[PDB]
Amino acid sequence: MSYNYVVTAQKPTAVNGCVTGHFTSAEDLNLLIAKNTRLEIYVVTAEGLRPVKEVGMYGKIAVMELFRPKGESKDLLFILTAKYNACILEYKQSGESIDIITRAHGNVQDRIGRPSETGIIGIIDPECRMIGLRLYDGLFKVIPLDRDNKELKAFNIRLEELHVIDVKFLYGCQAPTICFVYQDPQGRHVKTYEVSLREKEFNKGPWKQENVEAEASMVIAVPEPFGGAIIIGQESITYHNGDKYLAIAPPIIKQSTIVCHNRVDPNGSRYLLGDMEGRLFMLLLEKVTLKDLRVELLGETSIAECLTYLDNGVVFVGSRLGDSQLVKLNVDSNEQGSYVVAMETFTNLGPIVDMCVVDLERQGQGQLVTCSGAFKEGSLRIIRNGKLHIRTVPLYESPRKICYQEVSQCFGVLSSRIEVQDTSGGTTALRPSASTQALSSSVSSSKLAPHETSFGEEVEVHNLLIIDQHTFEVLHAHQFLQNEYALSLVSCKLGKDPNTYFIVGTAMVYPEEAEPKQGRIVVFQYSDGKLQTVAEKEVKGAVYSMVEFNGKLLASINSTVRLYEWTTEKELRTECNHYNNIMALYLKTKGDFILVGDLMRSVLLLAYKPMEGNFEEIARDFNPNWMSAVEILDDDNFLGAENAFNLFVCQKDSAATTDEERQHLQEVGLFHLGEFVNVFCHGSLVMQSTPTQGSVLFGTVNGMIGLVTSLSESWYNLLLDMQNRLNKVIKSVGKIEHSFWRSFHTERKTEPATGFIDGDLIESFLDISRPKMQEVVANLQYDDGSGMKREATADDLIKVVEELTRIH
Amino acid sequence: SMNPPPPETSNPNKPKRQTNQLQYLLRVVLKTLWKHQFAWPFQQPVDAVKLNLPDYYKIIKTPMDMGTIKKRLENNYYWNAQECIQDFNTMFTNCYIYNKPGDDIVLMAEALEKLFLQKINELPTEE
Amino acid sequence: PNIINFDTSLPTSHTYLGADMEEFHGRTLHDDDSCQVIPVLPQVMMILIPGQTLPLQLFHPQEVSMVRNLIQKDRTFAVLAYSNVQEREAQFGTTAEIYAYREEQDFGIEIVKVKAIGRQRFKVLELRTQSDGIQQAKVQILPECVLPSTMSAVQLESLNKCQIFPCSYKWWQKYQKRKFHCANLTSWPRWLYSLYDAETLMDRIKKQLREWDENLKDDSLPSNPIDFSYRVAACLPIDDVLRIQLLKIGSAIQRLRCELDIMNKCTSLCCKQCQETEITTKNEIFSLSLCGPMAAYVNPHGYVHETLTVYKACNLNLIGRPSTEHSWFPGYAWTVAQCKICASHIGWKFTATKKDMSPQKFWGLTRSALLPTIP
Ligand SMILES: Cc1sc2c(c1C)C(c1ccc(Cl)cc1)=N[C@@H](CC(=O)NCCCCCCCCNC(=O)COc1cccc3c1C(=O)N([C@H]1CCC(=O)NC1=O)C3=O)c1nnc(C)n1-2
């Protein structure tokens, strides 16, 4: 009943994992990168990287490790998905054809078990004796790496330590040995076990348990001749190996928390470390046994999600908060004291927290301006089709919202920067960002806090940036009040006022107040290069959302939805209120229809009654699940994104049959996207007799961008059957069922995808050979548009899929 | 309409005495039924005004309750045990008459009457 | 206010129900979403909450036979949450498992006294009254929706090693800053996700409850959010419609949020019949029993009252003399209390018999007669 079509306009750019090995050939140095639902395989060259194979999988890559069992010429690739699809793959090339064959595959999901807090952990024993999976608390899954286990059968071993932080397979052990950091009421400890395949059980470890740092988080398996394990916390780097115990506490690592590591030298002499602030350190092990540990600050890179050393001092830095990097490590530091020189920068749009569509250059040619990244990696991204040209405007602070004002030829962007407590009294920024380097800046004037400050703790400073549309210079940066958080942003005209204003909703956030009880609605006018505050209104709560509503202002304040009218005296006058059973986080509009949304998937549809001056509840639905973004497709369809990377679509029945049933929103569409949608907005990037109606672009966390549109019943049926016939013929990497991948999957329920057409699967029809096309179209006759049953050939569907691709 | 006066409990012209059966009926029977769980509706005359039962004293021509019987025993109103036994039975019979079989209060009255009868079989001979 | 030397274990025991009952240690739990055919007790009119102790006294022969049949079987009956009490309409309900029973002889009639406890919520699929007059209910077990951490879908893998944690406001600031860091990847800040975190809501409820019961949360209050939310709901003095709306909630997060919103808004307790006569305030609430300030007790006639213990009460008339017969709180004598304006029964005034007891007097107000009110 939904009849919807969702397609990917930009593949995920964020990097969540990267490894190096010998996957394509025993002589080649291969770099493997994971981008959620993408796997990229390059060959490391003296120049840089040479792309050899990019594939897509029907899952979210959570574990990616290379290993070579004795008896194989080159490395094999182990991959686990978010839905617990495990697979072992091998690279195969003959001439020009490149195929990623599946050596083994299987679902490793248990019938019962609580998914743990540290998430999925996957390790491989050095001698390729087993694969250890850590998915549920108190259970260690073991997949023995025999030549007969093509189904990847596994067995569980009970864990007395229920809260495991990290675990690694140790080197140089007669039996496969795991070393892990756990926490109990006594504190955090490190402990070793041996995995017995004969008994399928645990045996006492090589060295006894030790009490470690309270924030010991990372475990590194040091290879031979060293052996042992390195434990990294927030203040100390320790090393354990039987009788060997060596701890250091370098203060240079106390500033930020180290979150990733990578081995440089094959023997474990040097390691790379990356903290949350993007700093890159070098951990050096001094020699048969270890002599000492040393930490040297190499420099600053992008906020690294993963690191990998290539060769000749070239390091790849995979980032999810910003652009990924290829950097060079020199022996001698430069004039500023950094050993790091950037060689190449790869664009990453993630995370996209907000976006808008503007006809910047040519009229009718839509372009997408997005707020991307966070902290020093934050930026604006301008995307237009040519595949996609992208311009980057670095902000060095965290952008949150954005809107376009045509009459002023500029954008309004909400942003936030981190500062630390001054030595005397006040705050100080860590780096110069967009808010501190504007051509003109101002702060709000108070018109409305015990236990002040602390010792150098972080505080957020929120600003409204007026940014030129042609040059993207920060024309103005208005700072908000102390302890004021900016939530909503709107550019519109109101009432009989011809001036266009920037309207911002805020909230007074204090640590003692769990829920804000104080907020502002501020109305600025930008003109002549300076921002002036036109209006200020105080509200008793947080302004979570604002929407221009037929020349009026619709604003959500906590659990209330209020309508303001713009008076002749240029003030905000309340017209009506609606007090809801939920706090209105999401507000969308269409005509007189208002869509109110809660974080736990509580949906409400109201209507504004003009002749009465009040709101009226039209419908509602209360199915609890973590939401993320909502949108109105048409008068009767409401699209949303929720928990576990899923999309859904609800319907109403205006006429209907029973007043008790007219108030219910029927769940008519479900789909598993694999991305965490952060923003919906109507618009398209194609130049403006089409099988699709409407166009809603959505931006996600991993940088992926998608498009959703509506279909007719005949088109939806034809495309669903096309999907079935294409799944019957297309070979999947890892042999994962497309229906299983697209199934609405939370750990509480799994249903098949309904009312949604996977646009990518239908577009893959043009990339298969003509015989497979004739296979798919064979014995079709599912066309019920004329009234009977029209036959279909390969060329008809080729043209259909070409017209469907021409929408993005 | 309004409630009638309660039954009389003392008469100075009436002779008083302490027979063994009546002192047993006071110290044992009425004490056993009075502390019982279901006793409270019978511890005082039916307040037909507060209970909104305008037909109660039109149907019940001989009202009786355990409070009246207690006061009659304490004031040595009874000359013999049969008087007090008949008062108890009049109370129970009135309760059965005005109400309907199976009503909660009918079951409570049946319980109290069963306890009364099993206590009354142990009536001692006079001194 | 004052201090107390009462021993709060005696109220929970329901000692007024006779000698030591035959107690059961077994437990029967039905699988989620499964359908069961459960008998319904006729005279039960309470909206039972899981975990709430329910005492009953049954002397109708039909009720006694049904209770015997239940004792010989799985010891579970259905308590319908009536939306319309007069026409016996029920869409939701809660199962109750008998854990103690006692048939009393040397009594005028055969009477059975029972202590049960609510177990699982359920939806009423079908109600059919048998030829015996007793009715059975085809019933669907409603599951407990436990949702994962709101940051589980947005968690960075590199930060997975920091999601396990080793002046309370500073500790909670650090907790919020560390657990909800990845919130910067979404359209919402950290303090918003704190409003849907089970532990934060539980701590705020723990403060608002420390107001009433002086028992430390180290043992008396559960750690599981579902058990905690049900324990809180069982002792919240609200009207039947609010209680049904709270019973319809499946997610413990929404339940805790609704309970906190009630505790923050609701301040006065007025007469339900008057709607305009203040009886007490949230500040005079105090717990005389382990189960909290409010608990279900049974009178000598099978009627069930959810009594809430408060230190002071206003606008009440006292009817009759104090009595210790069938006292729910041993050592205290009760006195009927009516509203000063409409004369409706609000509860009882309990007064101590020994001059050494503390408190010397308090008020037990029945929930069915109260109405929450916000100024
Ligand atoms: C005075 C009389 S005379 C008399 C009747 C009465 C009430 C009846 C009748 C009907 C039903 C029952 Cl059950 C009993 C009696 N019926 C009429 C005919 C008639 O009009 N019937 C209509 C239905 C009336 C229902 C009215 C039902 C009663 C209403 N109150 C309660 O039940 C609750 O209050 C009580 C009562 C007693 C003891 C306690 C409580 C209580 O709250 N607590 C608490 C205190 C605190 C604590 O710590 N512990 C506790 O336990 C008690 O201890 C008729 N016929 N013949 C006769 C004779 N009667």
Ligand SMILES: [Zn+2]
């Ligand atoms: Zn009243």
